[PDB]
Each structure stands twice: as C-alpha cells, then as structure tokens.
From Swiss-Prot, chain A:
Keywords: Ribonucleoprotein, Ribosomal protein
One GO MF term: structural constituent of ribosome
Keyword Transcription regulation: no
Gene Ontology CC entries for this record: cytoplasm; plasma membrane; small ribosomal subunit
Protein name stated in the entry: Small ribosomal subunit protein bS16
Similarity comment: Belongs to the bacterial ribosomal protein bS16 family.
One of the protein's GO biological processes: translation
Organism for this UniProt entry: Mycobacterium tuberculosis (strain ATCC 25618 / H37Rv)
Residues of the full protein shown: 2 to 92 of 162
Swiss-Prot record, chain B:
Organism: Mycobacterium tuberculosis (strain ATCC 25618 / H37Rv)
Source species, domain of life: Bacteria
The encoding gene: rpsT
Note: Was identified as a high-confidence drug target.
The protein's name: Small ribosomal subunit protein bS20
Alphabetical list of PANTHER family matching this protein: 30S RIBOSOMAL PROTEIN S20, SMALL RIBOSOMAL SUBUNIT PROTEIN BS20C
GO molecular function (one): structural constituent of ribosome
Role played: Binds directly to 16S ribosomal RNA.
Chain intervals for the UniProt region annotation (Disordered): 1-21
One BP term from GO: translation
Protein family according to the UniProt entry: Belongs to the bacterial ribosomal protein bS20 family.
Gene Ontology CC terms, in alphabetical order: cytosol; small ribosomal subunit
Keywords carried by this UniProt record: Ribonucleoprotein, Ribosomal protein, RNA-binding, rRNA-binding
UniProtKB/Swiss-Prot annotation, chain C:
Record protein name field: Small ribosomal subunit protein uS4
Gene Ontology molecular function: any one: rRNA binding
Source organism: Mycobacterium tuberculosis (strain ATCC 25618 / H37Rv)
Domain S4 RNA-binding: 90-156
GO biological process, one term: translation
Entry annotated with the keyword Ribosomal protein: yes
Entries under InterPro entries matching the protein: Ribosomal_uS4, Ribosomal_uS4_bac-type, Ribosomal_uS4_CS, Ribosomal_uS4_N, S4_RNA-bd, S4_RNA-bd_sf
Subunit and interaction comment: Part of the 30S ribosomal subunit. Contacts protein S5. The interaction surface between S4 and S5 is involved in control of translational fidelity.
Curated annotation (Swiss-Prot), chain D:
Keywords, comma-separated and alphabetical: Ribonucleoprotein, Ribosomal protein, RNA-binding, rRNA-binding
Membrane-spanning parts: none
Entire protein: shown range: 42 to 135 of 135
Name this protein carries in UniProt: Small ribosomal subunit protein uS17
Range of residues in the leader sequence: none
Biased composition range(s): Basic residues: 2-18
Primary role: One of the primary rRNA binding proteins, it binds specifically to the 5'-end of 16S ribosomal RNA.
Gene Ontology biological process: translation
Length: 91, 82, 200, 94
RNA sequence: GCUCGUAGGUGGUUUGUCGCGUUGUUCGUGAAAUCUCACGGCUUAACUGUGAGCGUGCGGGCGAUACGGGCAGACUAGAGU
RNA sequence: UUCGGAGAUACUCGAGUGGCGAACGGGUGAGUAACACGUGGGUGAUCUGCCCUGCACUUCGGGAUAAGCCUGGGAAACUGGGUCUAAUACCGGAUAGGACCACGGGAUGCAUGUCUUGUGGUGGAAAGCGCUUUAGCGGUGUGGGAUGAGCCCGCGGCCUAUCAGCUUGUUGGUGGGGUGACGGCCUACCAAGGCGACGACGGGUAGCCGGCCUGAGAGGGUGUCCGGCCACACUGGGACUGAGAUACGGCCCAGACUCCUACGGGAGGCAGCAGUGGGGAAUAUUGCACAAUGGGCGCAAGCCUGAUGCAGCGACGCCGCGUG
C-alpha cells in the first residue's frame, strides 16, 4: 500500500528524519512520493513539524502511517483531527 | 527452503486451470462447427451455453474478464453474421 | 602539527621581526644561515612566497589550512585581502593575544589548547576556533588564580587593545563588538601578494 | 445515506501533435507518406539547421496526391509504422 | 590543373498577412542528495539540517512583429535576352 | 495411575492441509548503440493484490483428499496402493447491470469515437471463525480515489565509408486469430512497396543518468561512494503459479563442471553477508544487535530480517589536534 514513514538522512550518529509519503515496496531511503514533515529525536524533547494539510490529504486518501509516524501524528493532533477525536493539539 | 509447498500447490493449480481452459476450447470449437453448418437452430443455444461457460471461467479466475468479453463478442457477432 | 622551532631564524629569513616582547631582537644582523650574507637574486616569485610565509608564521597556521582560508576569502563577497585578514584574525587564540592576555602568539596558542577558556559557557580547546560578532569569551572559572594567567592580570596596560574587541574588569572577559578590520589593525605585511601567489 | 455511484473527477483531454507537410508518396493502399521539415539551432555552433522527416499517415478514403500540403494529427499505432492520420488537404497541389 | 553542374548553403528594393524562428509574461515540470549564498548543530572543521538560488531546458495559455522564414503581390538597380 | 504408564476434553504445539508473503529488500555490470536511458508528451489502446471510500449482498447444497493407520517398491533421492477425516481447500445450483448482442435517446470531439442513459435478449459471486461479554476478525459483486505498471511518440547524448545497397512478414490493405491493451503480434489472400549520403546495412566499443574531476568560461575526461532507471543470476531455451515473474537462495529440458551410488540412478550453483583458492601492482572480519528506521505474517503480544544500525581491520582519503 502507501505508507507514511521515516527515512534516516542524518549522519553516523545524528539520525535526522524526514516524514515521507512512500509506497511500501520501496527501500527506506528511496524516492518518496512527497515529503510532508521532519522529525529530529535529539532536541529538548525533540523537533517535530508536519505539514498538517498535506498530512490530512494523505490520511484521507488512504495512506497508512507506520507506528512511529502514528505516534508523531498523535503528538501533533493531525491524527485526532482526521479521525474525529477531541484533542486536536497535544504537543 | 520450504518452497516445496508452493511447488505442490502450483502443480495442483496448473491441473485445474488446464482442465478449465480445455473445456472452454471444446465448447468454442463445437459452436464453430454449429455456425459453419449454419442451421441457426442449435447454435442459438450453443452460443448461450458457451458464453455462460466463458463467464464462469472468468469468475473462477482461470482467464481474464477482458478475454472472456473478447471471446463472447466474437462468437455473438459470428452468430449475427449467419 | 606545529612548527616548534627557533622563531628568530624564521624572522631572520623573512627580514622582519614577528615576535617582539622580551625576545624582541637577537641583537645582530640578518644572515639567516651560513650563506646568509649573500646579496642574492630577487625574483617576483620570491616576494609573493615570503609574504605568504609572513602571513602563515605570524599566526602559526599550516599551509593546508591557509589554503582553505584562501578559498574562503576569495569566495567571500567584497574584496580578498581584507577578508583573508579578517578570517585569519578571528581565530580565538589570536583574540586572546590581541586582548592583552598573552606575552606572545605561541603561549596564547598553548593557553587556548589547554582549554583555559569558555565562549558561551562552552569549553573550547581548539586554537583555530573562529570567534564571531557578539561573542563573549570567558576564562574557565576553575582555571584562574594560576600563575601564567594572573601574571597577565596586572600587565594589561602596555600593549593597546584594538577597537573591535573589549576587555573588562578583574573577571578577564572579552566582548566582540564586530568582526575586525585587520587592514586597519596592525598589518606587518601586504595582503595583495598572497592573492598573487595563489594565482600561479 | 452519493447513495449511488460517484460520477467521475473532471479532467482535461490531452492534446495530440498537429503538423503540416508535403505528400511524398501515395501508392500504398489507404496510406499516405508525408514529409515534415523542422529547423533547430545547432547545439554548439549556433546556426539554424533544417532537417526533414518522413511520417506515414492513414487514409480510410485514399484521396491525396503528390504535392498537396496536408495537416496531420498523431494517433495510436494504427500499424507497424503508421502513427498519423490525415486531417485535411489544405491548398491542394497545383 | 581548369570549368560546368546535382543535393545543400546563402540571397537585391518594396506592400500586406501568418506568427514557424525570435522575443515578453504566466502555469506545470526540471526528484532527493551533490553545487553556490545565508543561517542553524556537533568544543572548531570536515560532516550534518534548513531557506533561497541553480536546474541554461521542455510542454500549455496569453501578448509583439523590428529581423529571419512562409504565403500573395509589386519594381528594376543584380542576372539574362 | 504406571508406580513408569495412562486421559485432546484441555492452554500449548512438531509434522500436515489452507491464506498471505516469497516478484520487495540484497548483489553484479556480462549483454545491450536499443524508446535502454534523460527530458517532454500521449494512452478515446491498457491493467493494478493489499490500502481509502460510496452502494449492494453474504443464499442452498455435494463429492473428495493431505495428515493419520496398514502396506508395496528403491542404495539412496523418493515413490505406488488400501482404508480414514476436516475446513475460509474443491465442485454444482438460486438471485445479483458496469460481460455480451441488437435497437434507441442525451452530452460532448480528435477519425477511430468516448461518457451517461432506455428497451429487448443472454449471463456472471461470497465464508465463516472468535468473544473474561459494545473481546473482534472476516467474505463477494460493483462506482469512485490513491498507488504501481505496461505500451506509443518528439528531442538529446560514441568511433568507423579502407562498411553503398539493404529489405519479402519485408511495406501497406482486407477477413479472421491472439492480447490486459493498439499493432505483421500471428495467419490466409491481395497490392508492390519500405529504408538509404540528413549514412541505411555492417564492423568496433559501451550499462544510461543525477553527478564526479578539470577549466575564467565554453569545453574536455569520466559514470567509482550515494540516489534513480535498465539488464542479468553456471551457459542456452521454455513455461507454470500469481494482482504482479530476468522467478539470485522456484519448476522443466539440453550442455559444461563438482560430488554420491549397491551402476539401476541421484544432488548442486556465494555477481546475498562473512570467508577460501586463483589472477593480480593492488582492496577488509567466517564480528555484535534487532536498541532505532524500513520490510513480511498475525487482532495483538509477538516471530523473521547478514536490510539496516554499529563495531574490527587498512594514513586509503578529507578535516582537526598534539610532540610543549
Ligand atoms: Mg505456509
Ligand atoms: Mg480434448
Ligand atoms: Mg476479438
Ligand atoms: Mg593533517
Ligand atoms: Mg488495419
Ligand atoms: Mg540549387
Ligand atoms: Mg538557391
Ligand atoms: Mg531559401
Ligand atoms: Mg532578404
Ligand atoms: Mg535537486
Ligand atoms: Mg556553529
Ligand atoms: Mg512558454
Ligand atoms: Mg543590364
Ligand atoms: Mg506447528
Ligand atoms: Mg490471513
Ligand atoms: Mg505472493
Ligand atoms: Mg528480485
Ligand atoms: Mg554492463
Ligand atoms: Mg522518450
Ligand atoms: Mg493415504
Ligand atoms: Mg444467473
Ligand atoms: Mg458457492
Ligand atoms: Mg504472408
Ligand atoms: Mg490482419
Ligand atoms: Mg561490457
Ligand atoms: Mg582554457
Ligand atoms: Mg543470460
Ligand atoms: Mg561464477
Ligand atoms: Mg539459464
Ligand atoms: Mg496474490
Ligand atoms: Mg496466470
Ligand atoms: Mg530463466
Ligand atoms: Mg545464483
Ligand atoms: Mg545464491
Ligand atoms: Mg524466490
Ligand atoms: Mg562475498
Ligand atoms: Mg602481484
Ligand atoms: Mg598473486
Ligand atoms: Mg528491527
Ligand atoms: Mg521494526
Ligand atoms: Mg603507503
């Protein structure tokens, strides 16, 4: 199917991540259909921004996020907005 | 290796598909003989039976829906031209 | 690496004194070697070579690193010589020397190497560290009251303090108002010959 | 509670390539051969070079002679080598 | 060695039109990384992240007609009789 | 209860049937001068499992066999028979429009036409399992998305004329066949064309690109790490299963090679990671972990992952710092 995943594009010990919409039959650092965010697990808690309307578009059209990406969507409130749940912001 | 299971299931599937396709081929040749005779009487239901068999094969997944439709159209037009 | 050799020989070859201080002069002429008294041919390559030598041994920079500093300077907008001087001047050990905390350049380098300073509360021990505009430089609070650092606590009057950095009271701290302009700050050399050397 | 089939999404139909050229051959049973010329700057020297092509076009009703500047529209592979269809014979030969 | 001539290349003055060349603008595309400029983070740097460039191009729409070209004419200075 | 054996009812589970996966990921660059690649288009000529979403339905039956048990053959690799039992395995029906044929309407155009509708005549599925009680998983037909893929075309990027004539399914048409799809893709017949000095046909070399090196630039050289596409998997050919196959760790045949054999017959494929011999001027450890990300199956916990994340070794390179 279509996944929203994390691609490691940092250096040897600083795992920077981009939140990419990619087909499942693709290598981890392959050509993404669309990058819609980034995730840095090294800042004060961490650094997280999602587009929040392209994310909604992909979730509505049928992309299935992986489990860390689901965690980020729950943090940012986009997943709650998409499904129809009370807390639309939880950072 | 444990692809031996796939090896066996592939053989079973091959046998089933071969049987089905052979049955459709015999139905089609029978209809072709009927149309070549041109009596227009028995062909009128041999067409129905053959088209039903083609649809059944397509639903079983031995052939593709487009192939079934192609053959059905060809046979129906062959009947109409006689 | 580092040179770690007689500085007077290196000044005598280039016909210019680069050290000053207690060992300011060797009290003798400039035959830098056995044949040092010869009146020798003066090529055009020699002037550029020795000017770049003066630039390197004023700061104790190595050829490979100076080369990179050259691409930075020529690649920077503006001019070239003043940018090269600004880059070579913003080095943290040079800042330590110019802020009147050092007898020479080598010992300022050693004080920076042995980690006697913090910039934004960050322990640094690389001499080639580049200071910036609005940088504060603070001595490690657990490193003061040491003899070679407190000998410069009272001798802060003779050598002038340039007009881009600033020192403060007994807590010896440095503030950088803006990046320097070495062309108007103490050039013992012409920067227009390094550029010509790096074109052949 | 689109309670039946959802219609479509709107789309713009793609445009095929239309070109104008001179008929070269016709003795080919419902096929016409048209010569197309184009000019394009030289990659290095900058001069404008003129080159000619030869496409093969379709005539369900074969009426086109030598000369006969014609208009063509490229289509699906109607044959092994035919990809063009005759549109209209404008300014028929003298 | 010299000439004639095939394809090709190039072409006098002037009117109108087309807008192929040419040129203006806008939309799409020109993946990411690499490269350049500015920051941001590893004690500095190499390295790394972000933003803008670049991506010379190609396709679609809408303008211009000086020059080249096409199409329809005119002229006698070149060419010929 | 034997006092060393019993009892599928029972969590749990070796072997087995069934589903899904195994076509991704990983390697190499031999072949290939080609729509292989790059860039821009077309597909009214096409397909697309799982995922999203709208609308419908989930209805009756039936016969077997794997496994088990008893046997036969064989040196093995394997294999024959008789009984015996299921399923979301298989088969046959009922109803179900995006199947088909014929006749019509309404929209649009880019010639085939396309889209949407009406009538008549033919047809085409499904599968149940679980539940500490709103555990939960499912199944089939279709309209529409997203995704991936196929096919066609314009333009672009080597050397060679001491290679000048190439072509007969060849070029085109008609009727059939075939395909998911147009098409000489195939066939019967008919016509006599098609390509070529703007280099056909032939020979040499070569994976292509984003890029890398150099250069003031234009250019020149190059395609190694990384990323995209292509090709291949001992050599050559072929198909099957499937949504999807160059089918690296699948099948069949032929060939070379290595091995087993009771001589009748069998087995294998590091251009996966690590490693060995050889060649060479020259290039590494039979390392650790699924902790993170991606991937497959499962309701999930989970299980698998030499992808990957790191470590070891080599100044092999760039950068930085010391020997005051
Ligand atoms: Mg299985
Ligand atoms: Mg038979
Ligand atoms: Mg047909
Ligand atoms: Mg070094
Ligand atoms: Mg035809
Ligand atoms: Mg001429
Ligand atoms: Mg002429
Ligand atoms: Mg002309
Ligand atoms: Mg003119
Ligand atoms: Mg880019
Ligand atoms: Mg910094
Ligand atoms: Mg434009
Ligand atoms: Mg005259
Ligand atoms: Mg088991
Ligand atoms: Mg399942
Ligand atoms: Mg599968
Ligand atoms: Mg593979
Ligand atoms: Mg190759
Ligand atoms: Mg192309
Ligand atoms: Mg049995
Ligand atoms: Mg029915
Ligand atoms: Mg049934
Ligand atoms: Mg023939
Ligand atoms: Mg035909
Ligand atoms: Mg090769
Ligand atoms: Mg040059
Ligand atoms: Mg091969
Ligand atoms: Mg081998
Ligand atoms: Mg083979
Ligand atoms: Mg499948
Ligand atoms: Mg199949
Ligand atoms: Mg094969
Ligand atoms: Mg192999
Ligand atoms: Mg293998
Ligand atoms: Mg396999
Ligand atoms: Mg290996
Ligand atoms: Mg050797
Ligand atoms: Mg050797
Ligand atoms: Mg893991
Ligand atoms: Mg995982
Ligand atoms: Mg060495």
């Amino acid at each position: 199917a279509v996944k929203i995943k994390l691609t490691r594009l940092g250096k040897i010990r600083n795992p920077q991540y981009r939140v990419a919409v990619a087909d499942a039959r693709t290598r981890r650092d392959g050509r993404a259909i669309e990058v819609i965010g980034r995730y840095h697990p090294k800042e004060e808690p961490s650094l997280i921004e999602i587009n929040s309307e392209r994310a909604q578009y992909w979730l509505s059209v049928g992309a299935q996020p992986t489990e860390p990406v689901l965690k980020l969507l729950k943090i940012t409130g986009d997943w709650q907005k998409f499904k129809g749940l009370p807390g639309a912001q939880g950072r | 290796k444990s692809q031996q299971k796939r090896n066996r299931t592939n053989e079973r599937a091959r046998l089933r598909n071969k049987a089905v396709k052979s049955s459709l081929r015999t139905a089609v040749r029978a209809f072709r003989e009927a149309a070549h005779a041109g009596d227009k009487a028995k062909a009128a239901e041999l067409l129905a039976s053959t088209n039903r068999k083609l649809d059944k094969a397509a639903s079983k997944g031995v052939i593709h829906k487009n192939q079934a439709a192609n053959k059905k159209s060809a046979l129906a037009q062959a009947l109409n031209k006689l | 690496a580092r040179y770690t050799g007689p500085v007077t020989r290196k000044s005598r070859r280039l016909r210019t004194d680069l050290v000053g201080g207690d060992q300011a002069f060797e009290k003798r002429p400039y035959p830098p070697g056995q044949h040092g008294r010869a009146r020798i041919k003066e090529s055009e390559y020699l002037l550029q070579l020795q000017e770049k030598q003066k630039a390197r041994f004023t700061y104790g920079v190595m050829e490979k690193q100076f080369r990179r500093y050259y691409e930075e300077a020529v690649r920077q907008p503006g001019k070239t010589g003043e940018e090269l001087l600004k880059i070579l001047e913003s080095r943290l050990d040079n800042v330590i020397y110019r802020a009147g905390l050092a007898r020479t350049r080598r010992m300022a380098r050693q004080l920076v190497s042995h980690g006697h300073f913090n910039v934004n509360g960050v322990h640094v021990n690389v001499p080639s560290y580049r200071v910036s505009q609005y940088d504060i430089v603070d001595v490690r609070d657990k490193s003061l009251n040491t003899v070679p650092f407190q000998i410069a606590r009272e001798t802060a009057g003779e050598r002038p303090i340039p007009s881009w950095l600033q020192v403060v009271g007994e807590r010896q701290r440095v503030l950088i108002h803006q990046l320097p302009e070495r062309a108007q700050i103490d050039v013992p050399l012409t920067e227009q010959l390094i550029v010509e050397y790096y074109s052949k | 509670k689109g309670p039946k089939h959802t219609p479509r999404t709107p789309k713009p139909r793609g445009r095929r390539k239309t070109r104008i050229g001179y008929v070269v051959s016709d003795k080919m049973q419902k096929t016409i051969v048209v010569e197309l010329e184009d000019r394009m700057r030289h990659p290095l020297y900058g001069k404008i070079i003129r080159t000619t092509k030869k496409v093969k076009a379709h005539d369900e009703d074969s009426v086109a002679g030598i000369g006969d500047r014609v208009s063509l529209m490229e289509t699906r592979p109607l044959s092994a080598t035919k990809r063009w269809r005759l549109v209209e014979i404008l300014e028929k030969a003298k």
